[PDB]
Structure formats: C-alpha cells, structure tokens
Scaffold this active site. Structure first.
Site, PDB file in Angstrom:
ATOM      1  N   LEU A 112       0.807  -1.293   0.006  1.00 56.20           N
ATOM      2  CA  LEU A 112      -0.085  -0.032   0.106  1.00 56.20           C
ATOM      3  C   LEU A 112       0.619   1.161  -0.028  1.00 56.20           C
ATOM      4  CD1 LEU A 112      -2.334  -1.266   2.918  1.00 56.20           C
ATOM      5  CD2 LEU A 112      -2.912  -1.187   0.141  1.00 56.20           C
ATOM      6  N   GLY A 113       1.563   1.305   0.873  1.00 54.29           N
ATOM      7  CA  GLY A 113       2.749   2.456   1.070  1.00 54.29           C
ATOM      8  C   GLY A 113       4.140   2.171   1.071  1.00 54.29           C
ATOM      9  N   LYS A 115       2.434  -3.092   8.746  1.00 57.34           N
ATOM     10  CA  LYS A 115       3.583  -1.894   8.733  1.00 57.34           C
ATOM     11  C   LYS A 115       4.704  -2.783   8.957  1.00 57.34           C
ATOM     12  CE  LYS A 115       4.552   2.727  10.360  1.00 57.34           C
ATOM     13  NZ  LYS A 115       5.853   3.124   9.493  1.00 57.34           N
ATOM     14  N   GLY A 137      11.061   1.776   5.524  1.00 60.67           N
ATOM     15  CA  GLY A 137       9.737   0.884   5.678  1.00 60.67           C
ATOM     16  C   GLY A 137       8.656   1.006   4.809  1.00 60.67           C
ATOM     17  N   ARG A 181      -3.090  13.343   3.294  1.00 61.86           N
ATOM     18  CA  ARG A 181      -2.357  12.066   2.904  1.00 61.86           C
ATOM     19  C   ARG A 181      -2.246  11.296   4.095  1.00 61.86           C
ATOM     20  NH1 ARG A 181       0.923  16.497   3.143  1.00 61.86           N
ATOM     21  NH2 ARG A 181       2.591  16.687   5.234  1.00 61.86           N
ATOM     22  N   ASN A 182      -2.540  11.706   5.548  1.00 61.73           N
ATOM     23  CA  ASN A 182      -2.136  10.786   6.783  1.00 61.73           C
ATOM     24  C   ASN A 182      -3.499  10.511   7.322  1.00 61.73           C
ATOM     25  OD1 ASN A 182       0.394  10.133   6.963  1.00 61.73           O
ATOM     26  ND2 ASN A 182       0.997  12.157   7.794  1.00 61.73           N
ATOM     27  N   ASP A 214      -0.707   7.328  10.328  1.00 63.68           N
ATOM     28  CA  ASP A 214       0.811   7.906   9.807  1.00 63.68           C
ATOM     29  C   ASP A 214       1.444   6.962   9.263  1.00 63.68           C
ATOM     30  OD1 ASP A 214       3.288   9.378  10.200  1.00 63.68           O
ATOM     31  OD2 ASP A 214       2.493  10.354  12.078  1.00 63.68           O
ATOM     32  N   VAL A 253       4.083  -0.065   4.047  1.00 67.86           N
ATOM     33  CA  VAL A 253       2.820  -0.769   4.645  1.00 67.86           C
ATOM     34  C   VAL A 253       2.374  -1.752   3.509  1.00 67.86           C
ATOM     35  CG1 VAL A 253       0.320  -0.431   5.578  1.00 67.86           C
ATOM     36  CG2 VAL A 253       2.434   1.429   6.034  1.00 67.86           C
ATOM     37  N   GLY A 268       8.532   3.784   1.571  1.00 64.76           N
ATOM     38  CA  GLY A 268       9.456   4.896   2.002  1.00 64.76           C
ATOM     39  C   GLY A 268      10.905   4.345   2.014  1.00 64.76           C
ATOM     40  N   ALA A 269      11.725   4.977   2.484  1.00 62.21           N
ATOM     41  CA  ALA A 269      13.158   4.601   2.284  1.00 62.21           C
ATOM     42  C   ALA A 269      13.755   3.535   3.309  1.00 62.21           C
ATOM     43  CB  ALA A 269      13.995   5.721   2.528  1.00 62.21           C
ATOM     44  N   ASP A 299       1.983  15.368  12.074  1.00 65.63           N
ATOM     45  CA  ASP A 299       1.932  15.326  10.643  1.00 65.63           C
ATOM     46  C   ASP A 299       0.404  15.166  10.108  1.00 65.63           C
ATOM     47  OD1 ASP A 299       2.621  15.638   7.879  1.00 65.63           O
ATOM     48  OD2 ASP A 299       3.619  13.431   7.724  1.00 65.63           O
TER      49      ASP A 299
END
Ligand SMILES: C[C@@H](Nc1cncc(-c2cnc3ccccn23)c1)c1ccc(N2CCCC2)nc1
Length: 293
Positions: free
Chosen positions: A29-30, A57, A35, A157-158, A171, A37, A32-33, A153
């Site tokens: 789903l998501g 996650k 980690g 988007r969050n 988050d 999801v 990052g650098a 945050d």
C-alpha cells in the site's frame, strides 16, 4: 509523535502477540526509504478462525537499530491509545520470532488526498460528505489530544478513508517516500511538511496540541479544495517564510461553507493559546451538522 505531560516509557502488552505464520502478504500500500505498509491477509485475528484483511507495517532490511526501535515505539503508542472509530486501529503485532510487524486495520479506499483528487472532476462527493470528514477527523484528533498525544503530521495524506465513508487518522511515517513527495521540504537536518506546520513548529520546533490544530486547519483547506496543494504551485523558499509569519493565510476554497472557513481562521491564529481545542471544534462541526436539518 509525542506523549506529553515518552514513547520508550510506554509498555508493550503481549495480548497483541500474533504469529507471523497466520499473515499472507499482498499489494504494498505505501513505501518509504526504510519501511513500508503491506495489505496482508490475517487468518484468525478477530474471530476464532476467520480470515481478515490487515495493513502490516514493517521495515526493509536497510533499516537499522534506531529505525527498528522507532517502529517498536510506534507500536507501544498505538497499543496505549487503544481504539477509536476515527483512527487506524492496532490489530496486533509480531515482535517475537523476527523483526517488528505492526498489524493494523486496512482502509480499502486508500488515503483521503488521492481519493479527493480522483473525485475531483465510485460515488460523487457532496457537501455533506465533506462536512462528515471534518467532524470525523476532528473527533479522532480530539481523541488523540484526549490521550495526551500529538500527531505532528496531520494532513489529507495521513488520513485514510475506509468502508461506509469513514475517515481514519493514521501515520505512514517511515512507510512513505519523503524524497519524491514534494510536500516535504529539506531543512538542513531533516524533511518537514512546512505548508501544514504552525509558527512555533517552524521557527521553534514546539510540537504541542495547539500546533496540531493549525495543521488541522491546513487539512480543512485541502479537504474543501477537493485536493489542491496548500499554497498551490508555490515553491517553499525563504520568500514563503516571511508572509506566513507576517499573518498571511490561504483564501477560502470554492466549496468551503462560511462557518468552516471561520474555523480555519481561528486554527490559523498567530497565538497558539487563542486557537480552538479539538473538543471545541467537535461542538462547532456538530452545530453545522444539525443546522443542515
Ligand atoms: C502502524 C501504522 N499502519 C498504517 C499506517 N498508515 C497507513 C495504513 C493503512 C491502512 N490501510 C491502508 C490503505 C492504503 C494505504 C495505507 N493504509 C496503516 C499506523 C501508524 C500510525 C497510526 N496512527 C493512529 C493514531 C495516530 C497515528 N495508525 C497506524
């Protein structure tokens, strides 16, 4: 986030311990650098033995001890906060048997930001739909503040959107690529969401509940703008930092009702103490939701 008057001070309840073998990983789903999801299938998690869809996650093998201990703290906080209708709820974890896996609710319609942009010109979004997200996100944030917690945050988007058009505050954190996301500006030491931050956060790094309310005002803006970037098409340069400190706010979106803009105005107050509390915002959106009957 923060647990104001420590995340490592929080304990870990072993009641969440779920075995790695009853999870079946799927569509990421998501990412990052360090980690990401993943939409996984948890066989026997709520019921005795009934399969269900979760969002696990986790981190990539490129994440090291600080990044791994950041994930254990994330877990401890969620366990503490417990449950709320308007938050991405913790469903369990795998801490024993390998690396940290944080199993949470999965929100089928993804994030609100991409959903709004898809809906911008499977069902049409009306004013009642937008007012609902205002109330729902306000309730969830009021509950976060109630548990002496601060998001730091809060943005469309969050905020995720699940079945029955229910918005849940989440988050991504390590699970989102802040490198390519142009909403995150470099600040000589880390990348921050400048356009959604309050003055004490930008100029002093003071992350208090009050600053989370200015961020909420920025969310109200993109919500009622059907996706538009805060201070659109604008580069986040030094020229930007002057007019914000001066007192320059965003114009009302073409769809925002009058009462809602007043709320963004008080959220965007220069004085953090003369800003509405998340509990008071709930009562104001409750008022506008009854006014429409
Ligand atoms: C552990 C983490 N899991 C998570 C993070 N972000 C998004 C999702 C997710 C759920 N479904 C989808 C579908 C599409 C895309 C993403 N997802 C899941 C988490 C992190 C903070 C958090 N909270 C709750 C109190 C404030 C922060 N909740 C949960």
């Amino acid at each position: 986030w923060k647990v104001v008057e420590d995340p490592t001070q929080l304990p870990y309840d072993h009641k969440w311990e779920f075995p790695r073998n009853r999870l079946s990983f799927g569509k990421t789903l998501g990412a990052g650098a360090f980690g990401k999801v993943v939409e996984a299938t948890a066989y026997g998690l709520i019921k005795s033995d009934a399969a269900m869809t979760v969002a696990v996650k986790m981190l990539k093998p490129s994440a090291h001890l600080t990044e791994r201990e950041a994930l254990m703290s994330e877990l401890k906080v969620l366990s503490y906060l417990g449950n709320h209708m308007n938050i991405v709820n913790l469903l369990g974890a795998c801490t024993i048997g390998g690396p940290t896996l944080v199993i949470t609710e999965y929100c089928c319609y993804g994030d609100l930001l991409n959903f709004l942009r898809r809906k911008r010109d499977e069902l049409a979004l009306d004013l009642e739909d937008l007012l609902s997200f205002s109330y729902q996100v306000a309730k969830g944030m009021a509950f976060l503040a109630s548990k002496n917690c601060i998001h730091r945050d809060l943005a469309a988007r969050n905020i995720l959107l699940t079945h029955g058009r229910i918005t849940k505050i989440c988050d991504f954190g390590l699970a989102r690529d802040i490198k390519n996301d142009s909403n995150y500006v470099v600040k000589g030491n880390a990348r921050l969401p400048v356009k959604w931050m309050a003055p004490e956060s930008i100029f002093n790094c003071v992350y208090t509940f009050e600053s989370d309310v200015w961020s909420y005002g920025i969310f109200l803006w993109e919500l009622f703008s059907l996706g538009s970037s805060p201070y659109p098409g604008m580069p986040v340069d030094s020229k930007f930092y002057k007019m914000i400190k001066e007192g320059f706010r965003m114009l009302s979106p073409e769809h925002a009702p009058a009462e809602m803009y007043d709320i963004m105005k008080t959220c965007w107050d220069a004085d953090p103490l003369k800003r509405p509390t998340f509990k008071q915002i709930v009562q104001l959106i409750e008022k506008q939701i009854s006014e429409s009957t």
